A paper describes a structure:
In order to identify novel [name] effectors, we used Foldseek18 to search for proteins with structural homology to [name] domain of the Cam1 effector. This method rendered a 600-residue protein containing an N-terminal [name] domain followed by a linker region and a C-terminal adenosine deaminase (ADA) domain, with accession number HAJ98955.1 from an unknown Bacteriodales bacterium (hereafter named [name]-associated deaminase, [name]-associated adenosine deaminase 1 [[name]]), for which homologs were already identified in a previous bioinformatic screen. [name] is located immediately downstream the cas10-csm genes of a type III-A [name] locus. Further analysis of [name] homologs showed that over 70% associate in genomes containing type III systems (mostly belonging to the A and B subtypes) and exist within many unique phyla of bacteria. These data suggest that [name] is a widespread effector in type III [name]-Cas systems. Altogether, these data demonstrate that [name] deaminates ATP molecules to [name] through the formation of an hexameric complex that requires a Mg+2 or Mn+2 cofactor and an activating cA4 or [name] ligand. While the triggering of a growth arrest in the host is a common strategy of all [name] effectors, we believe that [name] introduces a new mode of defense for [name]-Cas systems that couples nucleotide deamination activity to a sequence-specific, RNA-guided adaptive immune response.
To further test this finding, we purified a hexa-histidyl-tagged [name] domain (residues 1–185, [name]-[name]-His6) and tested the binding of different cOAs using isothermal titration calorimetry (ITC). We found that [name]-[name]-His6 binds to both [name] and cA4 with a kD of 30 and 700 nM, respectively. We also co-crystallized [name] and cA4 with [name]-[name]-His6 and solved the crystal structures at 1.8 and 2.4 Å resolution, respectively. Although both cOA ligands were fully accommodated in the electropositive pocket of apo [name]-[name]-His6, they affected differently the angle between the two C-terminal legs of the [name] monomers. While [name] binding produced a minor change (from 58° in the apo structure to 55°), cA4 binding opened this angle to 76°, most likely a consequence of the deep burial of cA4 within the pocket. The Watson-Crick edges of several adenosines of bound [name] and cA4 form intermolecular hydrogen bonds group of charged residues within the pocket, including K104, that account for the specificity of cOA recognition.
Numbering used by the authors:
A (entry chain B): 2 to 168
B (entry chain A): 2 to 71, 73 to 163
The structure:
RNA sequence: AAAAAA
């Protein structure tokens, strides 16, 4: 049950790229983002509508478009970690791409991966930042997408068990 | 004691904004960044020359400029080495993870989580000051936003020499 | 490579 969890910001192209971090692909892809109006799923909709065997979901941190202070962040992080526990599969650690968002978003998903576990945590760098699916496919033919593996995390079984408190 | 650990990328000005996360500032400032040319230490050197009783240092990941591979077989180990030697020995440091590519911010978060931090935080600036008086203008007009992301107790990894 | 993948 290959599950990719992705943070997104205002560059939705990190998620189709993340999907190609492994040649097999992913059975599930779940994205967490702010609900800023700058967030755009159009490229995400068309891409995954073209992969009908992929369970795809967008989850927003309701009401928070920009993290600017402590309260914002603790709300973001609470809703993120609930999302992580909910979407991570039961008999297998998830794959997590922390590329999208402001730095606090990437760091909070890194910390969640360290707590609950992840088969791999990675980041994607693109020579020319593909703006579209077709330029992404161009870029990975030329080898201009670079996947940075930053480590397996076992997590803690007692922290995964927090999934029991959730609906 | 009262030690700020800061990751830097190609925007050195996150560091003096970080210094102003508290009115008292910090008694030491320690920066870690890659070895690329687009890192400019000059605004940092000029700033901290004006604060002589702050101990300031810059440490680069010698040999590594960009990180493109598995955290390029190198960044994380130097970062964690640097954190332990720079951190206070009987108190936890303050940590600003603002600068760098996402992987270097994420790696400092992880170091904070393992070794402990009094505070982990991030800094947003409306207009991205490029120099000190732009930052002091932004500070005056509420244009710099400090995001406190949380205390980290860390482990007994601190005990490492 | 701080308000959002190098």
């Amino acid at each position: 049950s290959r599950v990719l969890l992705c943070s997104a910001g205002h560059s939705s192209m990190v998620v189709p790229e993340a999907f190609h971090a492994v040649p097999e692909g992913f059975e599930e892809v779940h994205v967490f983002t702010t609900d800023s109006e700058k967030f755009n799923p159009v490229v995400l909709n068309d891409f995954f509508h073209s992969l009908p065997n992929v369970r795809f979901s967008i989850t927003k941190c309701h009401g928070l478009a920009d993290i600017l202070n402590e309260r914002d962040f603790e709300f973001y992080q609470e809703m993120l970690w609930q999302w992580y526990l909910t979407k991570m599969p039961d008999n297998e650690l998830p794959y997590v791409c922390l590329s999208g968002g402001i730095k606090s978003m990437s760091a909070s998903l890194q910390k969640a991966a360290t707590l609950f576990g992840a088969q791999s945590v990675f980041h994607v760098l693109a020579d020319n930042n593909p703006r579209n699916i077709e330029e992404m496919f161009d870029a990975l033919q030329k080898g201009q997408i670079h996947f940075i593996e930053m480590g397996y995390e076992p997590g803690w079984a007692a922290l995964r068990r927090l999934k029991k408190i959730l609906p």
